[PDB]
Amino acid sequence: MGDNIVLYYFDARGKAELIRLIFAYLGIEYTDKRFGVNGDAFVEFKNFKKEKDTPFEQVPILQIGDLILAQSQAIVRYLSKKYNICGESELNEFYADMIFCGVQDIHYKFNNTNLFETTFLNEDLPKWSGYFEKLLKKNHNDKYYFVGNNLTYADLAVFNLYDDIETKYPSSLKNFPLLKAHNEFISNLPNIKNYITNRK
Amino acid sequence: MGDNIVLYYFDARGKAELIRLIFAYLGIEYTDKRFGGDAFVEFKNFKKEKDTPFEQVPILQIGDLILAQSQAIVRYLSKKYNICGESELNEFYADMIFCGVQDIHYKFNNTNLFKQNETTFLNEDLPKWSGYFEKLLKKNHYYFVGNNLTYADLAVFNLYDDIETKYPSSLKNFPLLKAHNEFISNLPNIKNYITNRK
Ligand SMILES: N[C@H](CCC(=O)N[C@@H](CS)C(=O)NCC(=O)O)C(=O)O
Ligand SMILES: N[C@H](CCC(=O)N[C@@H](CS)C(=O)NCC(=O)O)C(=O)O
Ligand SMILES: [Cl-]
Ligand SMILES: [Cl-]
After folding, report:
1. Which of chain A's residues have a Cβ under 8 Å away from the Cβ of B76?
2. How far, in Å, CA of A101 to CA of A42, rounded?
3. In the CATH hierarchy, which top-level class contains the domain B1-83?
């Protein structure tokens, strides 16, 4: 809706996973195109760039019909605004954005470690986990929202962050109860639960 | 929640400059509060005195309301003052271009500020990304999105204004991008800001 949405990315979670989580949450049907399923992802990406008119030669790429959408954050924000999971006020829209940008700071650090340890594990992670803990405390019953009294993409971003972190470091939410409960809450959402338990 | 707008940052362009350019362009009166007395000490006191979410600047204080994160502040400011995008998809493209600016600005900052080898940026990043922005301007026939100025126009301007502080004549092979930068720089409010800027 549509009517044919194609997400282009490598065979990984990475920069596309939050877009996939947003699609799963909103029940948006789409083609999840992944480079590397058909053997060589490097050649398939090279061919993709010739085929599709990408503005920055990067993925994820969201294609809506002939419409080419690039940049994870821009796509996430575009989808969240279109389907009203960005905040129930002008200021709440900002807070979701602020939190999302904060996620990007600590997620980048995780990406730089996981994909490309000491500094992250001892200095960045616990400090930034404290930041989000305090932000939940500010706003927080089985519901855990970072913004207002409804789900924002910020919730899904923080969930994706620590879900991505907890694949490499499982015990990282032990000392952060609200963040742990937020993870549990988001992971068990009707639309979210099925996607995460059934994804590769 | 109102009146007194105060921007907190270091005495540098960095992550607050675009916000400063946006205030300048819009003609918004604000206190441009810059750290450093001792910057490192003042910032330590700032964190103790202000309730920042991530212990980072820029911080935008509107009354007693605390705003953090450059991009979020920029996007908030653009919506409130109507330099956000003149449609739903125009807002996306502005955001996309802004996100593109961040990708290459980050690469510039790594070499310009954090002592990374300049060659990779100069030979591999800068001209490739300048070509991306050049092509995006070509698609819009200066303005990146729509028929009016968006924050994306100021973001691109800020990007290459920052780049030219260390690497002048980088827009020689990029006429549309060079003319875009020159058009934004000659806007009365921007022109005035640049002249007063140290
Ligand atoms: N600005 C990022 C871009 C993500 C990114 O760096 N994409 C990588 C994924 S491996 C890519 O397609 N790289 C292309 C290349 O290295 O040339 C976003 O949020 O979309
Ligand atoms: N996510 C960035 C954060 C900017 C940032 O990294 N701020 C630096 C400026 S030097 C800072 O306050 N550093 C925190 C510290 O090192 O304690 C944003 O757009 O606001
Ligand atoms: Cl990544
Ligand atoms: Cl910077």
Report:
1. 90, 93-94, 97
2. 29
3. alpha beta
